[PDB]
Design a protein around this ligand. Structure first.
Ligand SMILES: Cc1cn([C@H]2C[C@H](O)[C@@H](COP(=O)(O)NP(=O)(O)OP(=O)(O)O)O2)c(=O)[nH]c1=O
Ligand SMILES: [Mg+2]
Ligand SMILES: [Mg+2]
Length: 341
DNA sequence: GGGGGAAGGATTC
DNA sequence: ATAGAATCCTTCCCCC
């Protein structure tokens, strides 16, 4: 099985460039402004000029601007990149029927039934990198390997505007000399919970008793790492179905007062129902971010769909329940709708 | 034992 | 004390 992974390079910023080509060559930063105080927010992405100096996803804008004040700082037009992204994915749907669209900027492709070795898979990578560049003028990065995980690591090395093929002997090489935190799906809390037991690369998973490994990271992550270490990881390219729809907004002040929070929560419900797009949900979760930035949630399921007016009603009850059973102050309030019909 | 709902956890982009 | 969104897994809990 040969998986072709694609992921666009600094996606949000690049769109800003192809839409205003002068931004080229400068360090660019796409920001999410919350409104609390002007320049409160996070950095969605930054181009590799700006990324060179430490501007990365997830940093506060206030910490970005101290490092590059004369860099361009644009607000996010996700609305735009989404339409740009949808056009690119229709381009990939012509190179295989079996395609997983992993996110706004990512796709996996089952090319087992369209090429038969890696040389032609590599060439089909170039085939795709160019038809993107001509149609829509975007550079992307291509990973190639035997399953979704290793085509993802392939692409992470090749960024930016790069193409990479991971053959079966370097697969065996990487299991041996890939530092474990770089495996997709383990971040820093799990990353050193494996350093704390000496695991730095995938190989060492086989050389550790299973029960001690399971007892700490859980069963699913254990089989995940072990099967990856045995060259026995197989999960298929599946059409992704949205399971969750939601919106969450930052309030201008922290508050525990039910009726000042209400308009935001109401605004979040209206916007969430627009995005629902004729899919009727059965579950609603009122989710709040606290002052210390913990995430509290309360949910409810129904034997029937939820209507907008029913959603309004129960949301307040779930929001009520939140502050009854937790007494911090809320900063961002929002809703999530699950269990569609 | 385990399916199923609810809440927290961790990761992703 | 900095966005916004989506997903899978774990743990306790009800129930058969
Ligand atoms: C990681 C991350 C990404 N994003 C958005 C903007 C990114 O451009 C896009 C994710 O694509 P990516 O592969 O995570 N990062 P990138 O495409 O900007 O840059 P590159 O792939 O590392 O070259 O979605 C966020 O809004 N918050 C994030 O924390
Ligand atoms: Mg990308
Ligand atoms: Mg990505």
């Amino acid at each position: 099985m040969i998986v072709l992974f694609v992921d666009f390079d600094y996606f949000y910023a690049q769109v800003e460039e192809v839409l205003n080509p002068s931004l080229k060559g400068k360090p660019v930063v796409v920001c999410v402004f919350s409104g609390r105080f002007e320049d409160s927010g996070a950095v969605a992405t930054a181009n590799y000029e700006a990324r060179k100096f430490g501007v990365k996803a997830g940093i506060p804008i206030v910490e970005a601007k101290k490092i590059l004040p004369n860099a361009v700082y644009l607000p996010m037009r996700k609305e735009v990149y989404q339409q740009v992204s949808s056009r690119i994915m229709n381009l990939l749907r012509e190179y295989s029927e079996k395609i997983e669209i992993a996110s706004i900027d990512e796709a996996y492709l089952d090319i087992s039934d369209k090429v038969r070795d890696y040389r032609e898979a590599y060439n089909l990578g170039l085939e795709i990198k160019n038809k993107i560049l001509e149609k829509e003028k975007i550079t992307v990065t291509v990973g190639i390997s035997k399953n979704k995980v290793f085509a993802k690591i392939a692409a992470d090395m090749a960024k930016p505007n790069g193409i990479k093929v991971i053959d079966d002997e370097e697969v065996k090489r990487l299991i041996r000399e890939l530092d474990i935190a770089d495996v997709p799906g383990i971040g820093n809390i799990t990353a050193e919970k494996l350093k704390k037991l000496g695991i730095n690369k995938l190989v060492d998973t086989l050389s550790i008793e299973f029960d001690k490994l399971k007892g700490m990271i859980g069963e699913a992550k254990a089989k995940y790492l072990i099967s990856l270490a045995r060259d026995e990881y197989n999960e298929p390219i599946r059409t992704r179905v949205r399971k969750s729809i939601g919106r969450i907004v930052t309030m201008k002040r922290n508050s525990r007062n039910l009726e000042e929070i209400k308009p935001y929560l109401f605004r979040a419900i209206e916007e969430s129902y627009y995005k629902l797009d004729k899919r009727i949900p059965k579950a609603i979760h009122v989710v709040a971010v606290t002052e210390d930035l913990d995430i509290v949630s309360r949910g409810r399921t129904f034997p029937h769909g939820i209507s907008k007016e029913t959603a309004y009603s129960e949301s307040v009850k779930l929001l009520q329940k939140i502050l009854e059973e937790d007494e911090r102050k809320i900063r961002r309030i929002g809703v999530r709708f699950s269990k569609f019909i």
